[PDB]
Each structure stands twice: as structure tokens, then as C-alpha cells.
């Protein structure tokens, strides 16, 4: 039987599902450690690998990319879990290797690929403490090209009064996502700062794992795909909205939590965001 992860319900996705909105024809790129395309609960449409030693984007030797992807789009069937936008066209853009790290040149190559291939939404569940003119340029171009770019804020917790949001999440053109629990409390690990935009469920998130498995993971990596999946539902309902309108709708209809430095605008509510 299929189980709906708490997080899907928390952001109110099922309401859209009920209306017949599930992300059909929205192209979402998971820029991460690849997606196990053999998983029975996922449907990968395409993708590319930018990791020199791991040329197949459909082999995930880490498990991270597959987990992120099931949050976005685990199929609606009688098995496993359920994604935020279960009918989306899922693309595996492999930029992290088996050890979960990757070079900036690879990540950037992957963003460039996503622009060229007309992805609607990009999910980046990754981040580093330092930026680069090339990294900024690539996210900026995606957004100028009409792509919704979503990134995990980071897992750096609090540090005095400084921002601990990593890159590319720190860039204004990107939506930086922090993590809450099932009670709406900020996860202690969730990165903080003025660049934080929204929150999403990121503690003990059940999703798909390679080799027809399921398991839980915690991190702002798990929070970001709820937002990416949410932008896919919105576009399925309003195919003519610009990335700008999608973003404003998500930000403008959150459930407000505590201070914006810790919670940004609050927890997204896709039901409200979809109008
Ligand atoms: Ca399923
Ligand atoms: Ca921001
Ligand atoms: Na940002």
C-alpha cells in the first residue's frame, strides 16, 4: 500500500491532487547524486551526468538524489510513497558522486544543461560555504530564462548573529529553503539568515532509496524538494504564470512562524499558493 509522508500533507499538496493537479507536463530537474531509474515508484524522463567518473545519471550510488526525487515525484499508485507532484517529468542531472560531493564546475554544467533543456523547475539540495561569479551567473540566467530555482538553505544551524545560509541558496534569484518538523518548529540544524525565504518539512522525511527501498532522511536537502514539487503543482494549474508569479504566490501565502531570520516567510501552503 501507499503511505503519504507527513510532509506532503503538511504543505497541503493532496488538496491539489484531489482537483486533478499533479504537475503533469512540468519538467523538474533534480541536480544531485543521480536518480535510481529502476525504482518502481519513480519515473525518470531524462537527464545527464556531469560527474566525470560516473557517466550514468540513472545510477545513484549515494542515495541522496533518489530520496530528493521521491519527495518531488514518487508516483501515485498502490506502492511506496507519494510525491508532491507525482505526474511531473523528472530529470536526473547528476553533479554529485557517490560520496555526495562534487565540484563547482560540474554543478554549473548541470545548471547550464537545465536552461538549455527547458526545465521549468530546478531543485538544488546541495550547497557550499563559498560562491563564485560563475555560480551566480548560472542561477541568474536560469531565472532570467523563466526557470524557478529552489535550493536547500544549509545545515549550519545558528552562529551568533551571522547568516549561515550557503550558496547558491544565498543568491537573491534563488529560493532558499529551511527545514521545520511536523510541529512547525525550526529544525535545530536549519541554516539561518536574511536570505532565507521559506520553510518546508525536513525532519525524518520518508522517501524512496535505491534498490526498491524507502527510508527517512533529515536536512534542508529534504525541505527543498517540497518547494520544488510545490512550484510544479502551481505551474500545472497556471501554465502561463512566470517563475516570478510562482515565487511570489509561494512566499505570499505561507503560514507565518517566528522571526524571518529563522523562518523566512514561514511554511509554504500550496493550496493557498495555487489560488
Ligand atoms: Ca507510490
Ligand atoms: Ca532569499
Ligand atoms: Na535566496
Curated annotation (Swiss-Prot):
Q: Which reaction does it catalyse?
A: Hydrolysis of proteins with broad specificity for peptide bonds, and a preference for a large uncharged residue in P1. Hydrolyzes peptide amides
The record's keywords, sorted A to Z, are:
Calcium, Hydrolase, Metal-binding, Protease, Secreted, Serine protease, Signal, Sporulation, Zymogen
Q: Which GO terms describe its biological process?
A: fibrinolysis; proteolysis; sporulation resulting in formation of a cellular spore
Compartments, as annotated in UniProt: Secreted
Which residues take part in binding Ca(2+) 2? Answer: 169, 171, 174
Q: Which GO terms describe its cellular component?
A: extracellular region
Please tell me where this protein is predominantly located. Answer: secreted
- Quick one: which residues bind Ca(2+) 1? 2, 41, 75, 77, 79, 81
Active-site residues, as the UniProt record annotates them: 32 (charge relay system), 64 (charge relay system), 221 (charge relay system)
Q: How does activity depend on temperature?
A: Optimum temperature is 48 degrees Celsius.
What is the superkingdom listed in this entry's lineage? Bacteria
Please list the residue ranges annotated as the Peptidase S8 domain. Answer: 5-274
Biological role stated in the UniProt entry: Subtilisin is an extracellular alkaline serine protease, it catalyzes the hydrolysis of proteins and peptide amides. Has a high substrate specificity to fibrin.
What is the protein name stated in its UniProt record? Subtilisin BPN'
Amino acid at each position: 500500500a501507499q503511505s503519504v509522508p507527513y510532509g506532503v500533507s503538511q504543505i497541503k499538496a493532496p488538496a491539489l491532487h484531489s482537483q486533478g493537479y499533479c504537475g503533469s507536463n512540468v519538467k523538474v530537474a533534480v541536480i544531485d547524486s543521480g536518480i535510481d531509474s529502476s525504482h518502481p515508484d519513480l519515473k525518470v524522463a531524462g537527464g545527464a551526468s556531469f560527474v566525470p567518473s560516473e557517466t550514468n545519471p540513472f545510477q545513484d550510488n549515494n542515495s541522496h538524489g533518489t530520496h530528493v526525487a521521491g519527495t518531488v515525484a514518487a508516483l501515485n499508485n498502490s506502492i511506496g510513497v507519494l510525491g508532491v507532484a507525482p505526474c511531473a517529468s523528472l530529470y536526473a542531472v547528476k553533479v554529485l558522486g557517490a560520496d555526495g560531493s562534487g565540484q563547482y564546475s560540474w554543478i554549473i554544467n548541470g545548471i547550464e544543461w537545465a536552461i538549455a533543456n527547458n526545465m521549468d523547475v530546478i531543485n538544488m539540495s546541495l550547497g557550499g560555504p563559498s560562491g563564485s561569479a560563475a555560480l551566480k551567473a548560472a542561477v541568474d540566467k536560469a531565472v532570467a530564462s523563466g526557470v524557478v530555482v529552489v535550493a536547500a538553505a544549509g545545515n549550519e544551524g545558528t552562529s551568533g548573529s551571522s547568516s549561515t545560509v550557503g550558496y547558491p541558496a544565498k543568491y537573491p534569484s534563488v529560493i532558499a529553503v529551511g527545514a521545520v518538523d511536523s510541529s512547525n518548529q525550526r529544525a535545530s540544524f536549519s541554516s539561518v539568515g536574511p536570505e532565507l525565504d521559506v520553510m518546508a518539512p525536513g525532519v525524518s522525511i520518508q522517501s524512496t532509496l535505491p534498490g526498491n527501498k524507502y527510508g527517512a532522511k533529515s536536512g534542508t536537502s529534504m525541505a527543498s524538494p517540497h518547494v520544488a514539487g510545490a512550484a510544479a503543482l502551481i505551474l500545472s494549474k497556471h501554465p502561463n504564470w512566470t517563475n516570478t508569479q510562482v515565487r511570489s504566490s509561494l512566499e505570499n501565502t505561507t503560514t507565518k512562524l517566528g522571526d524571518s531570520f529563522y523562518y523566512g516567510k514561514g511554511l509554504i501552503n500550496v493550496q493557498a499558493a495555487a489560488q
